[PDB]
Copies of this chain bind each other. A is one copy, B any other.
Amino acid sequence: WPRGSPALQLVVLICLGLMGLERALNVLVPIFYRNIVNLLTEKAPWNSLAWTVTSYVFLKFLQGGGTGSTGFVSNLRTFLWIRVQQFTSRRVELLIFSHLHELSLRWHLGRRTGEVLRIADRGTSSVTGLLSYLVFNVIPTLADIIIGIIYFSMFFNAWFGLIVFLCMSLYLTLTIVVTEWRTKFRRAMNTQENATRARAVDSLLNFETVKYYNAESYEVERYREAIIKYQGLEWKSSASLVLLNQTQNLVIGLGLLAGSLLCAYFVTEQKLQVGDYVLFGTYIIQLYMPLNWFGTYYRMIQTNFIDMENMFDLLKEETEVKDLPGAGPLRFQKGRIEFENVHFSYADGRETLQDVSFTVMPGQTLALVGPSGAGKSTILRLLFRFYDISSGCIRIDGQDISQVTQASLRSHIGVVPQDTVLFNDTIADNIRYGRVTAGNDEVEAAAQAAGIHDAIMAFPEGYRTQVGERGLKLSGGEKQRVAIARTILKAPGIILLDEATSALDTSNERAIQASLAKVCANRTTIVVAHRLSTVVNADQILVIKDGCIVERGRHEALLSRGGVYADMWQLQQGQ
């Protein structure tokens, strides 16, 4: 009974009560069947016979069969049951997805997505299967066991309660032990299956060397051997399944035989009448064709057990590198940035962070162009709250970044990337993606402010186009102009920027760095680059060898100094 919405409470309650009705008509259908046989044994009036027989046939319509042609009640149960499985499935999928995008960058670098999204989806499938399995299979079939014991031990002869109770115990125990034994065979068949498939696929994939040494004949022979070995073990596993099913049938056979003969004895001794015998025979088979399906669901709870703990592990792994639990906002006015004893160990990088101390001028442009290596992108990520400070003081406008909180940061800050990574979507969403809660007419206004109008008329249908892998393919300058529309919509306090090594054409280049100067106006920027035009518009440059600051000044100061920037400028002057 989830407390989400009152409609869902009523669907849950009506489906539970409807389950109760099905487990109630489980006993009525045999009881009616016995009454019909008694009406036919000694003669009955047709007028009452017809109504009782029709009443029975509609009750057997309500439950056509056990797990096959389940019947009106079970079918109506399953159709209304999905409308709470949608709720719980949707809720857990949203929660796990929010947690996946909660986790930090360092989690997301190496491990992929489809190897994790499968874990999420199969975990949701596992929990839905667990609740549906349990509530509709464990408690109902155990309830049927209690009703069989109770009803045959009260209203029919007590030793048939004995035969049924013993037969249920013999069946359930035998089923679970041979399911374990079959389980060890399942794993044994699976491990060889991996080997036969692996040898096959690599023997094919090495076609160059198979061709190189005439290896088709021996390759056929060894693949046939792997097939024969897999066959000779699959025979063993399927013989185990055969023995399991056959002894399930043999225990049902002994249980039915004991009851049928004992009932025959009591009916011939006339303590019971023929209807009671027909009831016993039809009630056992009804009681068991669910139950062989119970064993199947107990061997498909094994996969669920592995998925659920894995789902719980992913759900409970949160980096939580730094945050202020009091939700303390940011008080930002100009862009005063502080460097003092800023040291941090960096993983998987040639450069590291080694005691940098050079505050940037607020309102000005202090670029960082220098050596090969992604330490510039590293300090960009570090300033953009992606890695923990080990030792250092970072004070945007005079307050520590560890306690001013991330929502206030990303409201107060806006940073563009170097590779515009875009979806298979429209363009209107990707230009309003800077501020999704901003109106359309102003996002066309900011798009024309970026200059995106030219691609709009280049589109087959303009601002309502489809762009991506499932849409049209734009160019890099177009997409970076979408990105600058994103950031001017996002209204930054401080802009940080990077580019790749690609410039499309001079006509778009002059426009895009004109707009870069426009957005860097009234803003401090610490830009990183490898493009001469995006370096010369910035005045003062910081160059860092291996995490520590080494040169200083402006670009002509570096040229007269003769540093690595001067060598790069000579190399770009004459290639």
Contact = CB atoms under 8 A, between A and B. Distances in A.
Nearest to A220: B98
14 contacts: A61-B250, A65-B288, A69-B249, A86-B235, A98-B216, A101-B210, A117-B200, A117-B204, A121-B197, A199-B423, A206-B423, A208-B417, A211-B384, A213-B486
This protein's copies in its complex? 2
Interface stretch (A224-232, A323-331, A543-551): A224-232
A437 to B, nearest CB: 9
A257 B52 CA distance: 11
Interface string A200-242: 1111111111111111111110011001100100110011001
A93 interface: yes
A253 B201 CA distance: 52
Interface of A: 33, 36-37, 40-41, 43-44, 46, 49-50, 53-54, 56-58, 60-61, 64-72, 75-76, 78-79, 82-83, 86, 90, 93-94, 97-98, 100-102, 105, 108, 113-114, 116-117, 121, 195, 197-220, 223-224, 227-228, 231, 234-235, 238-239, 242, 245-246, 248-250, 252-253, 256-257, 260-261, 264-265, 267-268, 274, 277-278, 281-282, 285, 288-289, 292-293, 384, 386, 407, 410-411, 415-417, 420-424, 433-436, 469-470, 486, 490
A316 to B, nearest CB: 19
A23 B116 CA distance: 50
A65 B231 contact: no
Contacts of A239: 79
Contact of A71 (B37, B113, B249, B417): B249
B71 A257 contact: no
B46 A265 contact: yes
Given A201-B113, A278-B37, A75 B242 contact: yes
Contact of A208 (B227, B250, B421): B421
A101 B490 contact: no
Given A69-B249, A69-B252, A97-B220, 9 more contacts: A43-B268, A44-B267, A46-B265, A50-B261, A60-B253, A75-B242, A86-B235, A202-B423, A213-B434
